[PDB]
Design a protein around this ligand. Structure first.
Ligand SMILES: [Ca+2]
Ligand SMILES: [Ca+2]
Lengths: 346, 343, 49, 39
């Protein structure tokens, strides 16, 4: 009979599955879609109370402030190992993965409608006080770890041992201080109150975040599977995965949970991620003399000689002779190249 | 001299749900209009759309809510016909939800301040409905696959509600072992189930949450809004089964009684879905009908596990083509999976 | 051998947090099954006992 | 099989550093990016 119209050519799914699926030898124009999540690291004050913090210390002195480790929300971070694009390119070309498109979402937003759960009674015969207060929703997707900046308040706070902090803070550390650069290289260590992502150094990641701080503000959360964030820059490239690794970071403080006794503690939710990848032809920016210099420096013996480089060097004169010239009248002449051209002092 | 009238797509038949079973042309557009009543708990027969009054300070150890208090998801299924007549092997011809146009019915009912609301101050009127609210809808060709995230995993739920099974402290956050579909009305409470951000490949769910102790419900009401259900490939939710699935959950705020006992308020939600006929590759050919026939006539074997977490298949080498002989039989694929990086 | 070693959340192994990986290669006529399920009976359901 | 394309032409980075790059003489069609802060 009458045949239907030909269906539109969609991309062909090869294999769906878990993380073991990435190993498939595909072609050049393959695209993968990694779907994952991150759990919030809110402090977890005992084994029964995951996702909350410990209760807040109310009024510490500004000089003798010493918080504890269980009441500090920290950043979440993770590395997704990607397989190598083992190819046979010419003239110093490669292939790397490119984070083209992220599609994120907070998992568990309607759980905040639980009002019969030890929350503070809202009025005389009311229900429970819902979760509200200062909230912070952050996510960062890139091919390198999240390079961040240590900016805090009250540099005289005595942090505990588990949390990694800005090293030797001064009064300058209560505003921008260039000495407090660090990476995000550890889950559940870097607290949110000390570490903002570095606006000067995240050349390979794409970090997005918003903050709203009040005594009682509404946590407004949208949930949708059609929103889509493009991770491309002005040149049309995304986060390139230098080492075959995809770095995913997040921080989702949703508000303060007020207990029945009137004692507040934080609340965090998970964060879905969906990164769309592809294979980018790049060039090798580095010469072959970086491969061979690393091979030699781990097979040749380390010699503790006399210093032949530095401020106490023992090499006195080096002269480079290339090409022929007419005989100059000054043998004790001095010759070099200043900025671009050959110069000749005396 | 005036011109001819413009070409408008010709209406054929208007009516109820029985218009669906009419066999039409292949280039036919169907606009189904329906609604969903809120399953807010309904504490007795004379009070619909409310919930029961809220319990206040049940601690985490001993927390047992009641059945009529928890607002649950609304869902329904719209029976669509089957469209092929002969085999026509290769391509098939399914429905496709192109455009939803939704709306909450009854938003000006919240102007009723002479009802059982609490007196707002010394001689004022009633206190309006405000507080935590959540407006949600989903349109797809599958039931709304959803993820179980709650707080207070030691909550003892009633028997009427279906909840995430065997919760741990990991269930107070994202736990992968709480997958379920939305195939039952008034049993999946909203405080336990968010729609699954990974597994809904055939629905289009839309939702806004707005917490807070007293925030205004802001509800627009318009018949010129239009939501496009197409993905980045240009296809809407295909109806695999001969059915269209419609889900919603409308919480509009807390109704404060004269005694002070707060209780929820929900409203209905309009749906206007455009359906066209799209030609797809047949997911159920003769070979599927063959293999499903021999499936049902084969003896069930309860043997040792060969799939899942406790699986006993160790290694599968799938290999098809030919290859020049490698210099590495166990060729490494990840340069560094576990991490032999610096510092 | 020069990248910073992060110690993050388990994105590999038994306790992995990657939920799903799709891999696409070429073009295909539009399937009528958007969750392209392969096993006609993976669990063993709808077999005769 | 199928070979991947050539890489995309991006603007060539020349020199990266602190304040001392704001002394270097550059070309006519040179595009600098000054990154700074104010306390
Ligand atoms: Ca920079
Ligand atoms: Ca998915």
């Amino acid at each position: 009979p009458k045949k239907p119209k030909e269906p539109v050519q969609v991309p062909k799914l090869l294999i769906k599955g878990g993380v073991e699926v990435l190993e498939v030898k595909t072609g050049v124009d393959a695209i993968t879609e990694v779907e994952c999540f991150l759990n919030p690291e809110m402090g977890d004050p005992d084994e029964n109370l995951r996702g909350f913090s410990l209760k807040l210390s109310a009024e510490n002195d500004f000089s003798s402030d010493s918080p504890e480790r269980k009441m500090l929300p920290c950043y979440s971070t993770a590395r997704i190992p990607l397989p190598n694009l083992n190819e046979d390119l010419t003239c110093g070309n490669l292939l790397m993965w490119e984070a083209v498109t992220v599609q994120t979402e907070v998992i568990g937003i309607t759980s905040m409608l639980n009002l019969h759960a030890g929350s503070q009674k809202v009025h005389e015969h009311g229900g429970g006080k819902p979760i509200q207060g200062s909230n912070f929703h952050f996510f960062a997707v890139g091919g390198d770890p999240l390079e961040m900046q240590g900016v805090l308040m009250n540099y005289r706070t005595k942090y505990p041992d588990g949390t990694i902090t800005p090293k030797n803070p001064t009064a300058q550390s209560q505003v921008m201080n260039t000495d407090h650069k660090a990476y995000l290289d550890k889950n559940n260590a870097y607290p949110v109150e000390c570490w903002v992502p570095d606006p000067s150094r995240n050349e390979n990641t794409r970090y997005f975040g918003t903050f709203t701080g009040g005594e009682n503000v509404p946590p407004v959360l949208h949930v949708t599977n059609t929103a889509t964030t493009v991770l491309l820059d002005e040149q049309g490239v995304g986060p390139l995965c230098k080492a075959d690794s995809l770095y995913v970071s997040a921080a989702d403080i949703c508000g303060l949970f007020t207990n029945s006794s009137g004692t507040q503690q934080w609340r965090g939710l998970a964060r879905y991620f969906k990164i769309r990848l592809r294979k980018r032809s790049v060039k090798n920016p580095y010469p072959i003399s970086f491969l061979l210099s690393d091979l030699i420096n781990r097979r040749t013996q380390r010699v503790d000689g006399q210093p032949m480089y530095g401020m106490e060097s023992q090499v006195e004169e080096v002269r480079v002779f290339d090409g022929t010239e007419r005989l100059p009248g000054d043998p004790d002449m001095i010759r070099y190249i200043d900025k671009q051209g050959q110069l000749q002092t005396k």
